[PDB]
Design a protein around this ligand. Structure first.
Ligand SMILES: C[S@@+](CC[C@H](N)C(=O)[O-])C[C@H]1O[C@@H](n2cnc3c(N)ncnc32)[C@H](O)[C@@H]1O
Length: 214
């Protein structure tokens, strides 16, 4: 049933957690996770009525009223420190909105063990942000689904000084340099050459891709 992307995200969720899933369409992720006993309880939070309603309903349907709360809230407003959240997933958004959300709610994060994040784009910018604000990446996955590529970033409390390669391609994605890693950046590399002395932004970009794949 559950999407293959949403599958990965779930797989980094600390066994026993209390989850907050920001932008939980349809509550699919907290729902599966509650169902397989991998988490204790959850909060699905959504920012507009459409999705909020959808999540409310699906939770009833799976009769999980007393295991998942659904809140119409914007980003981290969705919880307070009393909810005692251990893990937050934030999936299916732009890199920079993910940053803005973490940004506008940075306060709340001190007692949060882990942060599972699937940006849609702007993966680099998030990394710059995450570095600059006292977060370190502990784990990274990539996957293909139905044409589209999807980076997942697992994060904790910490310092990290990243290479400019590591911001662009990812600390862990370019360690174990997988096949899915390779088409992404390949596909992107020809996308570039296709385009090709501002015609120079590209050269080095292209060169960087050549380099991390080599
Ligand atoms: C591409 S969907 C992904 C939903 C789910 N996390 C997933 O990846 O499968 C983006 C969803 O994020 C929701 N969202 C919830 N809270 C948000 C917030 N606080 N700021 C921006 N988008 C938010 C939007 O309403 C929308 O339903």
């Amino acid at each position: 049933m559950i999407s293959k992307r949403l599958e990965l995200v779930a797989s980094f969720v600390s066994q026993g957690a209390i989850l907050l899933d920001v932008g939980s369409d349809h509550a699919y992720l907290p729902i599966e996770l509650v169902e397989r006993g991998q988490i204790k309880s959850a909060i699905a939070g959504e920012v507009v009525e459409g999705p909020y309603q959808s999540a409310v309903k699906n939770v009833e349907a799976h009769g999980l009223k007393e295991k998942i709360q659904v809140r119409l809230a914007n980003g981290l407003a969705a919880f307070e420190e009393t909810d005692q959240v251990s893990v937050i997933t934030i999936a299916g958004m732009g890199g920079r909105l993910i940053a803005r959300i973490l940004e506008e709610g940075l306060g709340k994060l001190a007692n949060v063990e882990r942060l599972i994040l699937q940006p849609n784009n702007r993966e680099d910018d998030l990394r710059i942000w995450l570095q600059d604000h006292g977060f370190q990446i502990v784990a990274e996955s990539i996957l293909e689904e139905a044409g589209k590529f999807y980076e997942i970033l697992v994060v904790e409390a910490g310092q990290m000084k990243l290479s400019a390669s590591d911001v662009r391609f990812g600390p862990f994605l370019s360690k174990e340099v997988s096949p899915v890693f390779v088409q992404k950046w390949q596909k992107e590399a020809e996308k570039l050459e296709f385009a090709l002395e501002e015609r120079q932004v590209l050269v080095d970009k292209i060169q960087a891709i050549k380099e991390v794949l080599h």
